[PDB]
Structures are given as structure tokens and as C-alpha cells.
Amino acid sequence: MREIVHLQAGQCGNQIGAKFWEVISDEHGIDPTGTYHGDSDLQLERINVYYNEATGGKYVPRAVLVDLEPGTMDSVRSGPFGQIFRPDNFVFGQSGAGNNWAKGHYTEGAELVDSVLDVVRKEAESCDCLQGFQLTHSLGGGTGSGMGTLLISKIREEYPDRIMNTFSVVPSPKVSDTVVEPYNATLSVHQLVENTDETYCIDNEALYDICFRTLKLTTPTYGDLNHLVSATMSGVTTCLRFPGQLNADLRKLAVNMVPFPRLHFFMPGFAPLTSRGSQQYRALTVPELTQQMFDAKNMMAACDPRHGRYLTVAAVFRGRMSMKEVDEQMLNVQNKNSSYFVEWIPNNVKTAVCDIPPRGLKMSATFIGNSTAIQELFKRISEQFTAMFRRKAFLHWYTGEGMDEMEFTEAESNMNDLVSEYQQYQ
Amino acid sequence: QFRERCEELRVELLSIHQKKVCEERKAQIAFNEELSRQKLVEEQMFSKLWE
Amino acid sequence: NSSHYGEFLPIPQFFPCNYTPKEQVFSSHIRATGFYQNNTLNTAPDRTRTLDFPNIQH
Amino acid sequence: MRECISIHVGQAGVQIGNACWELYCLEHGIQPDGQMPDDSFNTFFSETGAGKHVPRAVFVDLEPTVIDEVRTGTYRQLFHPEQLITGKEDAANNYARGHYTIGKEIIDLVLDRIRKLADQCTGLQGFLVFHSFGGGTGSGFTSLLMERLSVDYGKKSKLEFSIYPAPQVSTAVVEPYNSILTTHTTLEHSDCAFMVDNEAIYDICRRNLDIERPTYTNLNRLIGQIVSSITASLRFDGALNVDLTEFQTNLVPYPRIHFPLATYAPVISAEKAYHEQLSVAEITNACFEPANQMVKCDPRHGKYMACCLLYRGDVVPKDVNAAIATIKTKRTIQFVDWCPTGFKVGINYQPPTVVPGGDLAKVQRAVCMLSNTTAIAEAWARLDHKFDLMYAKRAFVHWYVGEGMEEGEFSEAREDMAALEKDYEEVGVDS
Amino acid sequence: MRECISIHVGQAGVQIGNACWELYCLEHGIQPDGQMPDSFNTFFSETGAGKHVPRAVFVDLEPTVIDEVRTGTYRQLFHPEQLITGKEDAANNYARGHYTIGKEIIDLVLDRIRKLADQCTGLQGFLVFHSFGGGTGSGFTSLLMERLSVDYGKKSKLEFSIYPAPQVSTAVVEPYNSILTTHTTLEHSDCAFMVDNEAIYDICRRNLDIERPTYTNLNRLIGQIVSSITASLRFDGALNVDLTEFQTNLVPYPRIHFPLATYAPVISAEKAYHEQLSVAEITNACFEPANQMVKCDPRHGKYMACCLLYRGDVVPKDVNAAIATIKTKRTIQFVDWCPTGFKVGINYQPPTVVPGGDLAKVQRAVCMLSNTTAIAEAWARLDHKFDLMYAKRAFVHWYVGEGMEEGEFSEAREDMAALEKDYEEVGVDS
Amino acid sequence: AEKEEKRREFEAGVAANKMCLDKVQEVLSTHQVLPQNIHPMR
Numbered sequence A: 001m002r003e004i005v006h007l008q009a010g011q012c013g014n015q016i017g018a019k020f021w022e023v024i025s026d027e028h029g030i031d032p033t034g035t036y037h038g039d040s041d042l043q044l045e046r047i048n049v050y051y052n053e054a055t056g057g058k059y060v061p062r063a064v065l066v067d068l069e070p071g072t073m074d075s076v077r078s079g080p081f082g083q084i085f086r087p088d089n090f091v092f093g094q095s096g097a098g099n100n101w102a103k104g105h106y107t108e109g110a111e112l113v114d115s116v117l118d119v120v121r122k123e124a125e126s127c128d129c130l131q132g133f134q135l136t137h138s139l140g141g142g143t144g145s146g147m148g149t150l151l152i153s154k155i156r157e158e159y160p161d162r163i164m165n166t167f168s169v170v171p172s173p174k175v176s177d178t179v180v181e182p183y184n185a186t187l188s189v190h191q192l193v194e195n196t197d198e199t200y201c202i203d204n205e206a207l208y209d210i211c212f213r214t215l216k217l218t219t220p221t222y223g224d225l226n227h228l229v230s231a232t233m234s235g236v237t238t239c240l241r242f243p244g245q246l247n248a249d250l251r252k253l254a255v256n257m258v259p260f261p262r263l264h265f266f267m268p269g270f271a272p273l274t275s276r277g278s279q280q281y282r283a284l285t286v287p288e289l290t291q292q293m294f295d296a297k298n299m300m301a302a303c304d305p306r307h308g309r310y311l312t313v314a315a316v317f318r319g320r321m322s323m324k325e326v327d328e329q330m331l332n333v334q335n336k337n338s339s340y341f342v343e344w345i346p347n348n349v350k351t352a353v354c355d356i357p358p359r360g361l362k363m364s365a366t367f368i369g370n371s372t373a374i375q376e377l378f379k380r381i382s383e384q385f386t387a388m389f390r391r392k393a394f395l396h397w398y399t400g401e402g403m404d405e406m407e408f409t410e411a412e413s414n415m416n417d418l419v420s421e422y423q424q425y426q
Numbered sequence B: 001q002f003r004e005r006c007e008e009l010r011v012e013l014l015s016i017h018q019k020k021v022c023e024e025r026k027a028q029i030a031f032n033e034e035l036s037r038q039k040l041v042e043e044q045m046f047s048k049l050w051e
Numbered sequence C: 001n002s003s004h005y006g007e008f009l010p011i012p013q014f015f016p017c018n019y020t021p022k023e024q025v026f027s028s029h030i031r032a033t034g035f036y037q038n039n040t041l042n043t044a045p046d047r048t049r050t051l052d053f054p055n056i057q058h
Numbered sequence D: 001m002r003e004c005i006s007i008h009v010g011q012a013g014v015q016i017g018n019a020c021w022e023l024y025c026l027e028h029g030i031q032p033d034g035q036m037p038d039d040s041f042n043t044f045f046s047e048t049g050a051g052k053h054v055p056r057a058v059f060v061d062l063e064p065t066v067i068d069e070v071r072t073g074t075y076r077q078l079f080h081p082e083q084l085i086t087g088k089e090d091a092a093n094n095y096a097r098g099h100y101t102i103g104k105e106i107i108d109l110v111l112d113r114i115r116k117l118a119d120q121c122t123g124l125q126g127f128l129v130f131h132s133f134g135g136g137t138g139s140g141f142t143s144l145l146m147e148r149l150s151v152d153y154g155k156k157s158k159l160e161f162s163i164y165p166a167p168q169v170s171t172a173v174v175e176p177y178n179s180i181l182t183t184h185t186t187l188e189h190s191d192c193a194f195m196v197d198n199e200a201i202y203d204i205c206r207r208n209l210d211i212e213r214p215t216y217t218n219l220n221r222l223i224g225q226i227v228s229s230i231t232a233s234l235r236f237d238g239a240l241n242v243d244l245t246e247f248q249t250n251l252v253p254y255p256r257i258h259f260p261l262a263t264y265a266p267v268i269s270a271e272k273a274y275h276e277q278l279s280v281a282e283i284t285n286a287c288f289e290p291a292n293q294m295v296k297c298d299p300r301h302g303k304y305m306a307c308c309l310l311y312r313g314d315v316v317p318k319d320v321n322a323a324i325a326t327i328k329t330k331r332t333i334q335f336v337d338w339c340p341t342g343f344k345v346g347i348n349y350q351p352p353t354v355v356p357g358g359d360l361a362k363v364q365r366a367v368c369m370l371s372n373t374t375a376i377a378e379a380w381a382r383l384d385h386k387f388d389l390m391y392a393k394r395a396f397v398h399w400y401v402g403e404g405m406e407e408g409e410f411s412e413a414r415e416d417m418a419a420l421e422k423d424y425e426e427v428g429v430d431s
Numbered sequence E: 001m002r003e004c005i006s007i008h009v010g011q012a013g014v015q016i017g018n019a020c021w022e023l024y025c026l027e028h029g030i031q032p033d034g035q036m037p038d039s040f041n042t043f044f045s046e047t048g049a050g051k052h053v054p055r056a057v058f059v060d061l062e063p064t065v066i067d068e069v070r071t072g073t074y075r076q077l078f079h080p081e082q083l084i085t086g087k088e089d090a091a092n093n094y095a096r097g098h099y100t101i102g103k104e105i106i107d108l109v110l111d112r113i114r115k116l117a118d119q120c121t122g123l124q125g126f127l128v129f130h131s132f133g134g135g136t137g138s139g140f141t142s143l144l145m146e147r148l149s150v151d152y153g154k155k156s157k158l159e160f161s162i163y164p165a166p167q168v169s170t171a172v173v174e175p176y177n178s179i180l181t182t183h184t185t186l187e188h189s190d191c192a193f194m195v196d197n198e199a200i201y202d203i204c205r206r207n208l209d210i211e212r213p214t215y216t217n218l219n220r221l222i223g224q225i226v227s228s229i230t231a232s233l234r235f236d237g238a239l240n241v242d243l244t245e246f247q248t249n250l251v252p253y254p255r256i257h258f259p260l261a262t263y264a265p266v267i268s269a270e271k272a273y274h275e276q277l278s279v280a281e282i283t284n285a286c287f288e289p290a291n292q293m294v295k296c297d298p299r300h301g302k303y304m305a306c307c308l309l310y311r312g313d314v315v316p317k318d319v320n321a322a323i324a325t326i327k328t329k330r331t332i333q334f335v336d337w338c339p340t341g342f343k344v345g346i347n348y349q350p351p352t353v354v355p356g357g358d359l360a361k362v363q364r365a366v367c368m369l370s371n372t373t374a375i376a377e378a379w380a381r382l383d384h385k386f387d388l389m390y391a392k393r394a395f396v397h398w399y400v401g402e403g404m405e406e407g408e409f410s411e412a413r414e415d416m417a418a419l420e421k422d423y424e425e426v427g428v429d430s
Numbered sequence F: 001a002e003k004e005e006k007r008r009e010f011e012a013g014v015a016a017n018k019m020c021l022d023k024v025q026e027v028l029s030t031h032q033v034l035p036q037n038i039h040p041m042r
């Protein structure tokens, strides 16, 4: 009764969404030929959240994939589950942005978004009561970060009274996989602060840390990291399509998590993840989920909550599990730890319990926690953008494409606003 | 998809390529040796012309 | 000297084990045939966000 | 979809191109006839109905003895006969003759053939023009070649590979005169111009490849691997890919500074690949060695702006990001202060091929480099003094004056080069 | 995880490099072609083909010695880029190897050891072998010490040195080689050792029943000593010892880093048939000046520190039994300021004997490194020799012409004069 | 009945791990490479 249209922006959007459609079609028992192979009648009770009907007893996803290089697009279908998409949903340009945010926001993306919004209006019309949209992208490139912000502003003005989910991969400070990487991020968070209901901060540096320290993977390519990212996208919105003893859908957390409209940047982490050697040595209980859910090892961002104050906290659980013990452990960590939590917001943590677990596993837990320590991601990015822009480096590939010289000072002053607005809540 | 999901499979397909490259470079060594023999008989040829 | 670039005929030894092509036939088809275009009239059902067509009695 | 045109100009252009095209057929399963015994070939080859591929190359020259062994060689039948463009009489080491007198006779014929290859393409990604700064055809005829493509083709990428004259070993006398006059045209009429020196390749081929007696066969085999590294992201899939448009924007800080430096690693012999373990962290330390650079400029005197990296083979993103962390910690390697995120990473899947009769080995994993240092101020200041030394008494100027250009083009080109050196002083200095 | 980069310099260094690495091959069972038919990771490196390249760099200034290694039985085992050879040698001159010729190849090796150290995720300490007699082993080895201190700060640098003999010397300008390197190896050396050739000659004639030995039968004997030092780094024991440990419990002052090497038992295969080899009978043999490996007698001096390297079928039961009996005797003294002077290391694996060597099937062994005040006996003899030659301007014109001023002789002699006063105030009782 | 169900679930997990390891061994023993993945001269 509540549907979400899926958006994947750029290359990094395309590999994330490809693994995401596999992990929930297995969760819904759906083959890439398209039909239904299930053992429970409850799976098909709520499948309309993400799917549409097709002739022959088949279900197709509600996704459209925007891109600016067709080589990335055809790699998606050659993989695991590429035959489920309608080919009309694919849309792509001819000349890439070349990791230039201005080129993907003024010069190249401005012609593609007329064709993209032809298909977005079609998928949004087939629903009956549209819950919202969802976006996946990365703030380190040009296609995902440049046009990905423009597609937000095209649909937010059109559809104001909706919800709008965005997954942002904030560029890691230490890998430096792009030279203009601070230029791309600073002009994009400018559009994620004023135009977006919901935005998550996942860092590729922390995704390397979890796969190296906890999972003990010898060679974790980007296929295994997209197993990490898409396990959070299922657990956040599992309340929309599976019934529970205590449920909390997307708008219930969206109201409760943000105290002020500018502060919608969160840090996920997931709890039951363990190595194969150490899985047989540890039991699964309610305290075992929450002892690892709040460790700084399992944060999915390059921020440490010990340096700051937790503003508001969420935790969404999964499995058949007792919620005296859930609320017992939740009060316990608030009472021992008396400095990292804000004093003017008592009973900080929001909580939900879902009956249906991920397959092959007893219990699971997901985390969405807003802390003051988000500002170190924001302040240290602002310092590298000031190092570039003071001696006027690399701006000729952005200024000469139709964009003025005062736009950066608009974005830097707005970025300086948010690092101090987060400071006065500390 | 099982091969993509596994990792010890990736270890084995990493090792077999090196096991291939060993034989390829050994045959390259043999090729270089026969080229050296050709250069030697060229030198003997030009010495005979000088005589 | 210019013959040395092609004196030797190809040998199956002098080739890598892996060959990963880049196939773009379907993307070429989607570039050849455009990315949809709306000339239809607005045909949508009227809907209310709480209930669709209640049954009011008495 | 991704398509590119190669324009090999001069004898240095043709001989480099033959080394490039022998290796591209090996990479794509092409017989010397041109037929196969999967649209990877579309980037350089055009597909006909008969299952034949024709390269998108134009071999242009002003003397026939360089081009006829292409016409009667083993690869005599792959190339279309009208791609091989021949002039009637050569420029004879004259920048003026190739620009003013001789090059104006066949330039109209070239531009029609340049037109007849771009209309076939559904979308153009870039150009490749290969030239040497020593001779006249590679300097003078290449000079007005760019200005015709710059006016005719608006913003299409035109990459350049240059054979800059070696600092002490040179084959000519008017060779410094050619290099000064050609920088005036490669400044305002080029998108990116790569830099390789001859004398560095001789030192690498001796010490590392264990070759006591090199020839241009071994030198041009090394150069063709560099373009094969760049084009491998066009032709074969990677974990993350870098296009020609990609590193064009991410390497140059200013429009006047588009002269990177190349480095290939590993450069080892087949008897020593048995010995050394070849990994990801080992090969990237050999990219920063001033001994293994492909340009005779020492980057320890200068400060790095940015580095473009291209890894090929069996390489994972973690080993790259681990080895980048090792390089940045050391004090012997410096970066400019207004560019902390200096690096750029390219990863591909298909390992490099080995040519028959070549001198490398079968390598599982290699690495290229397109780095930009402030060490290229020293390579110009020595050429500035050599050109000033000859031009002080006005030697060899009557040949250039009496052929179409007046006396003062040297005086304005010297001040352009003197102003271009001061750009490197002001950008490189810490503030 | 533990790794150890070897460095060998000189014609002695290459000949002691080969004999040490020969028994290293039979200890781990690596064939001459580089392949087996994780103990070796401190000396060998890993390749995807399962090939093991040694972590050593031979350096020399003549082609006549490296070329025999390049065409020997182990021609494919050693890396060809690791055997750095010069073009013209210093020819028994410290100055030629220090100021003029040695500066040419100091740059290549310091790049070469960087490539092995970049392969080192953890490095225990460098080993250097050198001979004081030759110009390569004295001149370039002095700058090998000095640049290594700056390049790598506190990494361990152990040296096996070959001091000039008291009576039978291979060269005449050997005393000038000895004096001008001890000043360099004061402030640029972590730990040292000394072996003299007669002290090895006296063993093999008397104990090994070989009437006519060669450097083969010598260089195999130092190989038995170097193996036991790095033995516990390679194989576990009841309690082990690393390169860092036995260095710390031997040097009581930074100016004093000169122990004495000793090995026991050293017996023929015919004399291994008769004599029993217990734990007690091998520790008593390390105290004898007849079986000592330096021509100096500790009975004239005092032991300030001791170290022992047990190997084989040895238990802590018989270790503690013999040490008690040692301390009862009066012919062995200890300084009054070091009552607990002992350290004990115990290893499991017996030593491996090369086929064609000189020793036999042995089950128990010991290698002692006791620092004595009897090294000052040796320096008083050689400082007499350097004074007796430098008194009237002998062989000095060779050294001056390369570029070193004449005053460095008086610097390295008065530095040698202060070291005798440094070593005697340790030997006075409180 | 609760403790018996827990024992049953442990046995099922053990069987699943053994099955996945056996499938890993089988997919190692039989590797199939496409002709397009094969180089055309090869």
C-alpha cells in the first residue's frame, strides 16, 4: 500500500543496486527469470513495495538506472540478476562527465534529465499511495554526485509532500581516489542539506576496515562490500514489507531521528557480522547483538562516537526475539555511559522488532545513529577544499563550463554553516 | 553466481594463472635461446665471407 | 630493420590466459532507439491518501 | 561506441606506429590479413561486411623510403592504401619547409582523409598524434596540422606523444631550432602532450632489460606498451576505469601546463621474472624511482602536482590503497601543498600481451604512470641555453629566413619560452 | 614474521657468505635450483612459483671472487642483482676504500638494501660480516656503518669481525687497517664479535684432527656459530632468544660491545665415537683458553657478562646443574658489580652437519659469548704495533694521497688511547 | 520441545556448512570457461 521508486545514480549507484536486487529477491524467493519460487505465503503478501506486475505471474523491480557510460550499464546485466529489468528503465548518456561536477550538473546532465523524468513520472503514476522515493549515489564522482543532485531538485519541487531517501558515499579522506575529489563533495552536500529528506553517510575507508578487521576476508573485492552495504538497505526498510510485534516504517524513523531539518546525516553499522572461524565460538542473544552494534569497529563511517555526543539513536532488530530484553539492554547502555548522550533528550533510542530474519541466520540488528562526531567528516573535507581553492587550482575545468566564481564561496560558506551549527549542539 | 560469491575459488583462479605464466616464460626462454643460435651462425657466415 | 615488427608469425604461447571482452550490442540498440517520449494524455485514477472509495451508510 | 583516430606523422611516427599496430592485432586476435581466424575492435578498427577490420590510422610522411616497407611488408594488406599519405620531397630537418613550402601541398589531402574517418564514427573520444621534436615533418608539418584541426574540430581531444631531444645525445645540429619554434604551437593548440626522452629509454633498456646493444625495435616496443595501458580502459572492462576525457581534466592544473611524464613498471627480463616476486606494492615503488623514469629530469629536485596510475592484471583495490599509504609517509617524496589528494587510480583486468620476438616477459601484473612534476623546468633551461648559444651569432638562420618566415619569429618564441619557465617558478613555490 | 637481512663485504665476506649459506640450505632443505622437493621466512623470500631467494647482498670490489659464485653450483639460487661487484679494488688500503673508490658503489647498495627492507614488514636486525685486514672489509665497510645509522635509526647491526692476528699476518699495512676502523666501529656499531685465524687454526689442528686445513674448514666453523645465534629465531625452544635479547644482557656500557665467540663441542667423527657429550661436558669446554676462539686468555681478566646457546637434546635440569659447579671454582672470576651474570637460551633442533665437512652426528652443543676484560690484552699488543710503525713515517704516503689529511691517524690513536682507560676502570673493584 | 528444536537447528547448520564446502570442492574440480572468454588465437 506504500511503494518506493528506486534510483541508482552513476557507476557506484549501479553496482550497489545490482547486489541489492539480488539480496531481496532471494529474500522474496524470486528468480532472475522473474517468476515466484517460494515456500511461505507471507512473502507475497507484501511485495508491491518495490515491484510491479507483469503478464505471466511475474514481478519486475521498480527501479530506473541513470548513468553516463554504457560500459558500466552492460556489466550489470551480464552478472547475476540482470534480466529482471524492463529495458525502458535503463537510461544513459553518450559523453561522460569526466569526474567533473559542473559538467554533470550544467553541460552533460541537463539533456539527459528530460528523458529520465519521462520514466520517473511513469513509475510514480502506477502506484496508489506513493510512500516516497530512494536514491543511491556516491559523492566522489561526476555522474553520481553531479546529476544526482539535479534529479533530486527536479522531483522535490514536483513532489513536495513525500519522503526522499538518499544513500551518499562520502569520499574517504585517506584513499584519495580522485584529484578533484574535494571539489565534487563540497558542491554536492550543498544540495543534500537543503533538498533532501534523508541521507546516510557510508565511508569506503570504514568499509575497508570492517572487511579487514572483523570479517577477515583475504581478498574482499567490491562484490563483498556491496554485500555489506545492501544488508543495511534491507534492514532499514524491512518494516514496510514484513509484519512485526513492534513495527516502525520509514516515516516513523524519519520524524523521530531528525531534531532539526538541516541535521539528517546518519552513520549506519550492522551487528551480527562475524568471521567464519569465530562464528562457531559465539552465541546469538539480545545482549550479543547490542554489544557489537555500538562498537566503533562496526560503524560504517570514518567517525568515532567517543569524540562526540549522541543526538538521537535508532536501532531496528530482526528475528523472533523478546523485547523485555531489548528494552533492558537499551536502558543499560544509556545509564552506564553518561557523557556521550545528550542531556536535554531523555529516552534517546528508538526501537523496532521484526519477526522475519535474514535467511540462514537466527537474529539480526541494524543501527542508524546520529552523533556529534559527524562534523569531523564535514570539517576535514572543508579544509582540503580550502587548500585547493585558495591558490585557485583546477577551477578552469569548472568555471569555463558556464559556472561563475562565486558559486564555490556560496557552497563553502554554507558548508562552514553546518560545521558550526553541529558544534552548538555539542 | 556461486563462483562470484565464493573466495577460495578466487584464490585458486589466482594461482592457476601464475602456474600458466611459468610455462609461458619458460618457452620464451627457449625462443630467446634459438634466436641467440641464429645470431651465432650469422657471425660465422660473415667470418667466412671475410676469409 | 622494419621487417622485425612482423617477421614472426603468431604462436598460441604468446597470448594471455584471460580475455575479457567489452560487449555493447544492447547499449548500442538503446542508443539507436531513443529513451521514451510522452505524447499520451493524462489518464490517472482519482485517489485519496487515506481510503479509496469508502462505503458510507446512515 | 568509444572511437579514436591515430595520426602517425613523420618517420618517427611511422616506425612507432608499426610497433603499436603489431601489438594491437595480438591483443584482439587479428591476423596480418586483417580477418579473424565481442566489439573490442571498434575503438581502432572499422568493421566491413566481409568480416574484415581496417585500422583508424593515417600514416603521413614527406619521404617515400619510410612508407614503402609498410606498403610491401607483412602488414601490406591490413591497411587501406589511401591511409598511407606520402609527400613528394621531405622537409630535410626544416621547421620552415614543413610549415611554409612543402607541407602546404599535401595538407589538403590529409584533412579530407581525416574527414573521411570521423564521419564513419558515431561518436569521437579523442585523437592520437605521434611526433618527434627533432625532424622537420614531426615539428613543422605537425604544427600547422593542429591549427587546421583546432579550427575545424572545436573541442575534440587531441592527445600527443612527443620525442623530446635528449639533453646530450642528439642526431642533428638545427635540432634545437626546431624545438623552440614548435612549443609556440603546442602551447595554444594542444589538449595534452606527453613527454618521453630517448636517452632515458637507452639507459633503462641496458640496465633493466639486460640488452647491451639496443635498436629502435626495442625502444618502440616499450613505447607501445604505454599507449596499450591507456587504451586498455577503453577496450576491456575494469573494476574502475579511466577514459581519455577523465585524466585529461584531472592531471593538468592550468591550461599552460599539459606535459606529463611517463613511467612503466616492471621492466624486467624473462630470466629474472623467474627470480623476483611481482606484486602490487613492489611495482608502484618502481614508478617513483628517478632511475626508472622515462624522461631525463630528476623529480627529487622538483615537487609533484599529481600522479595518474594505471594498474593492469591481477590487482585488487586494497593493495593499491595500502601501497599509496606507504609512499605518502616518506619524506624523500614531496607533493605541492595545495594538492593533498594527489593520486588517481586506474585498474584493469586483461594482462598485457607479449609480442613474438620481443624483449619483455609474460607479466601477470604491471603498472603505468602519468605523473606531473616540477622537474621539467630543468629540461627546458638546458635547451634554452643551447638555443641561445647557437642563435647569438645567427647560425643556420639564413635557411629558415630564405624559405618563407622572417627573422623575428625566434625572438617572439624565445620570450614565450622565457615566460613559460616563469610559470613553473610561480606555481611550484610554496605559499 | 621475523626477518633478517644479511650483508657480507670483502673477499672474506663472500667466502664466509657462501659457507654460511651452504648450511642454511641443508638446514631447511632447499635445493640449489631454488625449490623444495615457515621457518625459512627470516632468510628466504616468497614468490608465486614457490621459489626462495635469500635475503642477503654480497658486496665486493673485485671481479675474481663474485664470478666464481656466479658459475658455481648455486648459480641459480642467488639473485644476480644481489651480488654487487666493483671494478677496481682498494688493494689492502683503508683510505682507497673510504675516500676515493668506495664512494662509487655506496649509492647502489644503499638502494639495493632498500628493496629488501621494503619487502620487510618486520625486520629483526641486519647482519654484517667483514674482515679488518682487507681494504674492502675496512674502508667501504666504515661508510657502510655510517650511512646505515642515518638511513635506519635503531635497527640491530651485529658484526662478525676478523681482527688482525698477533703473530702471523697476511699483510703488512694490516695494523693501519685495524686502528682506523675501531674508531669508526665505536659510535657506529651495536654489537661485535672477534675471531682470529690462529685461534681457529689451533682448534682444527688439535681438536678436529685435520693436519692441513683451508679456508673451507675455517669458514664452515664460523657457520656453526652463526647458525646457533639465529637458531631460536627460526625454531622454537623451551625458552628462546632473539637478536635483541642476548645483545641487551651482554653490553654493560655503550663503549664496551666486544664479546668473545666460543663453540663446543668441536670433535672428530673418530673422537665422537668415544667421548660422551653431556650438558656439563660442553659448558666446561667453553671456558678453556685452549678451546677459546680468540688468542687471549680470560684467566688474566674478569667476566662481566655471559651468554649461552644450548642446542639439541638439552633440558633445564642439566643446565642448572652445570652452572652451579662453574660458580664454585676459583680459576673463573666474575666482577663484583655483576653477581647475576648469566643468560641461558635453549633450543630443540640439533645442529645439521654438512656432508663433506669436518664434524659428525652431534646431539648437544653450546655457543658462549662472554665479555671479558681480556680483550684489552689484544689492543695493547696492536697499539704497540701501530705506534712502532707510525713512529717513523711508514706506509703513510699511500694513505695521504687519496684525500684524507694526515691528522686522522692521531685521532684514531688517541681514541684508542682513551679506550684502554675506559676498559680498566671497569676492572677495578669497589 | 524447545531444547530439542535448538539441537535440531544446530544439526541443520552443520549440514548446511558441509554442503556448501562440498559444492566449493565440486566447483573447483569442474571449471568451465566460455569460448568468448578464450582468446581467439588461443
Ligand SMILES: Nc1nc2c(ncn2[C@@H]2O[C@H](COP(=O)(O)OP(=O)(O)OP(=O)(O)O)[C@@H](O)[C@H]2O)c(=O)[nH]1
Pocket: D009, D010, D011, D012, D013, D015, D016, D062, D090, D091, D092, D093, D094, D132, D133, D134, D135, D136, D137, D138, D139, D163, D165, D171, D197, D198, D216, D219, D220
Ligand atoms: N624514441 C624514438 N625516437 C625516434 C625514433 N625514430 C626517430 N626518432 C627521432 O626522430 C628524430 C629525427 O627525425 P626522423 O627520424 O628523421 O623523422 P622526422 O622527425 O619526421 O624528420 P624527417 O625525416 O626529416 O621528416 C631523431 O632525433 C629521433 O629522436 C624512434 O624509433 N624512437
Ligand SMILES: Nc1nc2c(ncn2[C@@H]2O[C@H](COP(=O)(O)OP(=O)(O)OP(=O)(O)O)[C@@H](O)[C@H]2O)c(=O)[nH]1
Pocket: E009, E010, E011, E012, E013, E015, E016, E060, E061, E062, E089, E090, E091, E092, E093, E131, E132, E133, E134, E135, E136, E137, E138, E162, E170, E171, E174, E195, E196, E197, E215, E218, E219
Ligand atoms: N677468518 C678469516 N679471515 C679471512 C678469510 N679469508 C680472508 N680473510 C681475511 O681477509 C684479509 C685480506 O683481505 P681479503 O678478504 O682477501 O680481501 P678484501 O677484504 O676484499 O680487501 P681487498 O682485497 O683490498 O679488496 C686477511 O687479512 C684475512 O684476515 C677467511 O676465510 N677466514
Ligand SMILES: Nc1nc2c(ncn2[C@@H]2O[C@H](COP(=O)(O)OP(=O)(O)O)[C@@H](O)[C@H]2O)c(=O)[nH]1
Pocket: A009, A010, A011, A012, A013, A015, A099, A138, A140, A141, A142, A143, A144, A145, A169, A171, A172, A177, A178, A204, A207, A222, A225, A226, D240
Ligand atoms: N562503496 C563503494 N564505493 C565505490 C565503489 N566503486 C567506486 N567507489 C567510490 O566512488 C568514487 C568514484 O565515483 P565514480 O565511480 O566515478 O561515480 P560516477 O562518476 O557516477 O561514475 C571513488 O572515490 C570510490 O571511492 C564501490 O563498489 N563501492
Ligand SMILES: [Mg+2]
Pocket: D011, D062, D063, D090, D091, D092, D135, D137
Ligand atoms: Mg624526412
Ligand SMILES: [Mg+2]
Pocket: E010, E011, E062, E089, E134, E135, E136
Ligand atoms: Mg679483496
